[PDB]
């Protein structure tokens, strides 16, 4: 591992690699991999009545 990519430590490199790992990719189940936490608890106090046009 060339020492100039990402942080000044090694583990920083592998921590960015995990954003490129094949089995780790974003999808309908695993989403918002890179910031999960900025979006957390965001709609708790947002009250949205669900959609019904059918009785």
């Amino acid at each position: 591992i060339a020492h100039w990519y990402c942080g000044h430590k090694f583990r920083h490199r592998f921590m960015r690699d995990k954003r490129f790992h094949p089995s780790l990719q974003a999808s309908h189940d695993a989403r918002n991999r890179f910031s999960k936490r900025r979006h957390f608890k965001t709609n708790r106090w947002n009250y949205q009545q669900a959609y019904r046009d059918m009785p």
Binding site: S23, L24, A30
Partner: protein, 141 residues
Amino acid sequence: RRREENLYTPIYDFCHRIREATEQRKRFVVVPSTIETRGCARVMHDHGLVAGFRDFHNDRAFAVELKYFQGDSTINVIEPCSYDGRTEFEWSPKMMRRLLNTHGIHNRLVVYICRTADNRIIDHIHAVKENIGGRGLMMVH
């Protein structure tokens, strides 16, 4: 149980069952019953790495009988080719031919086992014989 974890194959687990039941010196193992698994069993029983085996047309399982010699197993090591089912390793005829050669002497010691385009489970030596490439399963000696 979760994402990062490996996705297991009834080959992976076949191998680790046999490994572990060889370590505890058991005479019988119950083992997952799919196609390439009992294929692998027949191949191993050909090469005399296993005392015998049977499929009862039980759906889940069939059973292998282990062989011991001079106080320890007949199996040094047995390892699956792939940790996942999401990874599929392809063996060129030349590679399988390399395995056979130990610095100029023909060496059949170790056995490697393949699927073929034809759905047969073979060792690498027959494969090399007819020059077919196949998908890797496991290696045992």
